[PDB]
Amino acid sequence: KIERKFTTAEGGAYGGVGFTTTVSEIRNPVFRNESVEVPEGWSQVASDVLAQKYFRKAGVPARLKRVKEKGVPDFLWRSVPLAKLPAAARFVGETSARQVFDRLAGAWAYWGWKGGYFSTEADARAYYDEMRHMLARQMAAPNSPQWFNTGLHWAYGIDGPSQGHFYVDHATGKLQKSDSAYEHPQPHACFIQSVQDDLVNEGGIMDLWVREARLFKYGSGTGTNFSSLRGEGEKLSGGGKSSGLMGFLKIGDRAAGAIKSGGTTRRAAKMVICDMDHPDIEQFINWKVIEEQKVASLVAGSKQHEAKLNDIFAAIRSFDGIEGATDPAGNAGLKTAIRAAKKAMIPETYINRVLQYARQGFSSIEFPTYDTDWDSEAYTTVSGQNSNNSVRVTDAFLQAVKDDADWALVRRTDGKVAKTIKARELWDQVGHAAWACDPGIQFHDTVNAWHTCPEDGQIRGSNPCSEYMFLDDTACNLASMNLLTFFEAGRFDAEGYVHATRLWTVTLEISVMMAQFPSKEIAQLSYDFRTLGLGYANIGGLLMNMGLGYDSSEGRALCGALSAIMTGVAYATSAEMAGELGAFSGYERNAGHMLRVIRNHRTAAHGHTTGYEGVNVSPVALDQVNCPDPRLVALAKSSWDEALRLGEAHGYRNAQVTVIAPTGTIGLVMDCDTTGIEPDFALVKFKKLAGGGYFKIINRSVPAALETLGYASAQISQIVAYAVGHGTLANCPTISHSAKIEAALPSDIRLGFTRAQIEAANDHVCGTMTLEGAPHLKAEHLPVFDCANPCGKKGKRYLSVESHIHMMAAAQSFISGAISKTINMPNSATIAETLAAYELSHSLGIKANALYRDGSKLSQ
Amino acid sequence: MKIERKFTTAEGGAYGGVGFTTTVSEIRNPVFRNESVEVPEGWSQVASDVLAQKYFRKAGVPARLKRVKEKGVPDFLWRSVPDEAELAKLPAAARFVGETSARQVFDRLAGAWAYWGWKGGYFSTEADARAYYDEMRHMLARQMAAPNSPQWFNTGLHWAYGIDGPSQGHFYVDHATGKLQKSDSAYEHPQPHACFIQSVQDDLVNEGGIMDLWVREARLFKYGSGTGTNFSSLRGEGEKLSGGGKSSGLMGFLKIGDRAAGAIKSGGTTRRAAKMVICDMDHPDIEQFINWKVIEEQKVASLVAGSKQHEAKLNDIFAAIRSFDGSIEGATDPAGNAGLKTAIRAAKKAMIPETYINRVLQYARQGFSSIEFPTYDTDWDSEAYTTVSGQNSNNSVRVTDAFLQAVKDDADWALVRRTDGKVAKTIKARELWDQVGHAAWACADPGIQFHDTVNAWHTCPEDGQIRGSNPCSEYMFLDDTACNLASMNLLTFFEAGRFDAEGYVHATRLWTVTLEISVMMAQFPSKEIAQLSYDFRTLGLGYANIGGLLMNMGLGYDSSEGRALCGALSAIMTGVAYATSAEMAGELGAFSGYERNAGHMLRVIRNHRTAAHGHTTGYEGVNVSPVALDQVNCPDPRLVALAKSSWDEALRLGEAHGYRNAQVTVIAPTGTIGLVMDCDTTGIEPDFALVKFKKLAGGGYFKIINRSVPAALETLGYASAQISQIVAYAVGHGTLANCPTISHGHGFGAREIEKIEAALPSAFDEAANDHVCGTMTLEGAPHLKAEHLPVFDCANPCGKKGKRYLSVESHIHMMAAAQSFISGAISKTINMPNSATIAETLAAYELSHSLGIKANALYRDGSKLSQP
């Protein structure tokens, strides 16, 4: 039975929340539509995403039916389909955010009782309402495929023919294939597919491209561990040798580059992992490195070709007295030009080719040159630029870290040593590759120390963002909650955080039941383990609304405390669903292992530094000391004391509870100041609206931040004008008096007018873009405003590399799947410091990570 | 059906008068050796090497065998399996060996044909089956004919040795029930088909779609087969999807299957994947298809130049820091190192991206004073050529007669969309023709296939138009069908100065039966191919060594007589083969798809027939009239009579019972089976040199005269006293006796002994070199008349001094004489001199269309970087 904490039955889901109307549009130097209706306090980057990312533009009719069901209530009856109107208006597109809200949360609760997740009809609406309130309050949101593909058959009756998509009955447990692609929604965007050492059969190499391409066609991402593939030189039973791992990786990389995510600008999300003991590991590590060099040589050689080949055209037309010019015997400078196209390594074929054109009386040569733009032809020529490539490393390899031991790259066919190598020498290649370009790293022993069901195999791979780590051929449904939107007044709504987690743990399962999967194996494996992926975001957005730095043990404490609460309330919620409907079919097989993941969790939640069973690196305990504790750190010990006790009685409905996803698109309709576990990137940003947009404003985070500290209202406006500027040169900048000030704060003049970069005008008319060296503010209270990058042109302080990592390790001891992250390092970063970030990550109990040095790639 | 004997007697068997002897085959680097090779005495060392290293079953052949008695099966046709009881009397190493004699190959080849043909009811009596068994093996031993390599690899392994294995994804149709089945075994049903034409639909991930095609293609590449597909059904780039968004275009998905083909070795060997990609001239992306390989060759060259420049210019940066005095960061800055500022200057003058100059600077700061920047070259197998795309495909363009008309009329050309059929973009037809000319002139691609000439001879239009071909463009039929090939060595039918037409008709009939039995015995790599191959049963009988036959008859390749002979021999082959098909349809019925295409095929047969009677008119529904059989110029008037009689009988029997097979003849390249047959020339090709290298058993070669040169000059009438002087002019006297430029001396009398005997190697280290090692040509030779000189023209000039060769026109007109009597097409790639222009390449494509040719391809010498 579910409660009611944010709504009343009399007011419904929208009592206390207003409503407005805005207009979304595009145009180049013509997609439009204006009726789009959006709730209160909603931004337009929120409103505009929903208008063409999540709205349906056609296919719903004007007014349509209910259907008689008898199981459960009237308000959750499906809708199904024109002589009222002409050919038009039988053809309408969505227009209000409540239309999608009611079809998302309605289809949630509709299927929800079909499975019997409710006790009474009173719970159905008390859940149908309570969840729409969090959608309108931007409190939480599921993954984007749910924002559109859920509830079109429930609320509108949209349907069509289908194939390839297979599901299972929620009541019988039988494998079925779909006759419709809409009546069974598709809530999953992550997939961890498998691949075998085989070409043409199912589950093989060429089959995987067929499996990935139907994923890419729908918009989902996929990740695969390819180390099952035998290396280059491994023999064939009745033939010769294999081409190698990289040769087949380039087939899939080329296929990902040609298949768009549903046809739009979005690239294909694809992850390519390889074990450290693979014979072709050095080719895998240096894949992006040498392909990046091919891009560099393509632009250098093409320009050198275009120049020299025209200088050879020079000597034949500089000749006046004939065309004896083709001969490299008697011409003004053709003997100089042929040795000028040599000299620069131009192949002899294209030099004779150019004078072969001249003998036909030809004017030109069409030799295109290439650049370093990322959508160029050069990058499309090379491989790798469509895959995220990580490396699976065992703790044994990083125990040859210290002993300077020898590493065995073992063959796949006959499990025999193919080549020996110093481990640090191989570790040296990993540091250089990521320093210049990739690969990411995933610690195989750390991720499997928290694997809930190892009897069904080891954790071998991840999704394109390394956030979801379960068995192969498993999907996952996602949802993240905007953290700061429970924060009104000075306390934080723990009353609502656990109600949000408990309620959102349930809706995620209901689409493990509601779903229709792109393959039959993934369909059953999903039903068998009912994996979940609940996360949070915007924690960096509140951590200074809090009033305390991102790089602060007082902040990692709060992070690990609410990360413990969410995952604890989620596991305890899943144990409550296992007593009413039964644990997931794969639990009893692994009841001994899954329960050990949970006791290791709350041992890390009780702050204990010891007592861990089966972990390779003991997780970072939760800081009992430095947490602000608005009745919180004890609440984290409360849920896992209850999740362990409840799970011991009924098991668990889900094998995994939580993740941390890069809530990029989904964090925009939520008005999340920061995304995922990240901090904010600036104290100054912009924002669009109807007619024209991107009038610059001040990050509303630090007005409320300094309000938390001892400060008067006019006594922080203080610094906003110091940071956003005055929008005029009207009174005492260095470019006032004399040489029309309706630039209206764009923050350029269309100088050569003698101005020794005295752009304190920019510091004046447009603000310092930073609070470093600001009026009034106490020195000890500015580290609480450090961002991801140095704020502004003259800002110099930022959150260091360990600030990002230590924040991660504090949360990962209380999350099922890894935290997705790529930390920017300064251009100064050396190869030693790059491995230092990886080596620090494993010692801190992190499962996966990714680096990027500033200015390292030609894609700048 | 009755099978007669012409080459054997029942008492003599298959090898009566055929002597067998044993040789040695060996391979190594500056590895594998077979000390056991038994071959017919006439076989060369090269043919033995091909047999031993490619066709012999190298392992798994049991040393003791035992027959499996079957009911109704003659005893000599019984299967055999390992004799497990008698194998245990041997050391474990001797129980399963490899094949050792050509007889084993011959026996298991014809044994399986006779065995399966018997169960299929193809033989009237046991005597006919034994005659077939005997005549088949005799021809194989006598190098008169050969099936395509997959038959040499695979046919008879299960029938002769019981060799078996598991099988997935392969299918066949039961000859008795007609129901589709799945193979339990990988060897019981042989896989004799080498070429496949495959369809693809405008779909990404459904069966028959794009990604599924790569799976199908990969399945063929693993076994060693080649693929051909017309991709014109794929959406143009920018065509909207009804689910929202555009398609990324045809070239993007072509890049996928091209990258897959480069990563899959055909047959697992060092061989490359045989892949044919075809686009229609009205496709919206036709411009990117035409200039595809043109741009990729530039990308290769840019990689060669850009990498070496990146190497050279970035090493100098290190040398500027290493020879700096010793502050090593007042060394990394160019403000304190004058030589370093010169290096960065020379690096940016080379257009090297500065994002890469900051890296090597930051790299030197940490202590490393070295870097590996790999540099690429123009070799075909190196990393540069596999980085780019297209290299794993033969790109052909499919041209309509209306387009060629629009080029003549300077009309404009619409590029039709695939979804709605509306005009994507209008282009001038002539400038589109100029790109095809410029592309093929620069990087050999694209080739061309004439859609209307191909479908003018399509015998089964009710089941669709011929849309594509096989990798070498000889097989042309419906999509999702295969074809088994076999070629006859024409020269073997020439002895005592006359062409044994009676035996040629005999070999055609028996090999037509053989190829049809191969359809019945086969298993196929997909259900649709298995069903369609069962329903139409296309055969690919062909020939080789017509150029070697022409030279042996004293006829030039570029002559009316040589073209009239090939047309007659091609008319007899296809005529007898079609008449044999019609007779087989008399006893067992026409193929399932014939009844609805009868009026269509019989029309094709009539045009073949009227082409045989010499009529320059009398063709039904044909866009470009074929080259009718030259009646007055053929050197043997009896062959012109036999051609007319064969097509009269082929149509008469077709009118009665139809035909067992929808296609029947083809001209394959015969590259490997030509070596095993010891054909002087392959397919329709002429010869290439007047002196050749003979391979010795242990290793090394030594040059000899083209064996057809003495036979030619005899036919023309040159006396034996003149023959030896003409040959020694070409091959040389081997060793410095008779020279008039530098010979005997004034010196060594001791080291002279075998200074001189060491002069046959023919490296020679003025015109004294031409004396001992020969001119290697016949122009300017003693005794030889000037009107007989063209008889020795070859595709390439011979020797360093030789200057005449066969014209491009000679090649094309020889094709046109044969194409009129070929079911499919003729695999040909014409090599043109480096001096050729873009207009001359288009003229070659234009001349081929006007002469009834179905497809062609050109390679200008020196055009590709791949050519050393």
Ligand SMILES: Nc1ncnc2c1ncn2[C@H]1C[C@H](O)[C@@H](COP(=O)(O)OP(=O)(O)OP(=O)(O)O)O1
């Ligand atoms: N023709 C080929 N060229 C190159 N690599 C190939 C080829 N065929 C297969 N491979 C590679 C792909 C895989 O890495 C590996 C196994 O492929 P496949 O032969 O289908 O497996 P298999 O399970 O049948 O084993 P085996 O080949 O030993 O019988 O060999």
Ligand SMILES: Nc1ncnc2c1ncn2[C@H]1C[C@H](O)[C@@H](COP(=O)(O)OP(=O)(O)OP(=O)(O)O)O1
């Ligand atoms: N996501 C994609 N990105 C790029 N091209 C795509 C994508 N999906 C399909 N295509 C291309 C592949 C083909 O060229 C063409 C049709 O493929 P597909 O959409 O699967 O066909 P379909 O038969 O389902 O038709 P339709 O898209 O009209 O419903 O579009």
Ligand SMILES: [Mg+2]
């Ligand atoms: Mg295999």
Ligand SMILES: [Mg+2]
């Ligand atoms: Mg589609």
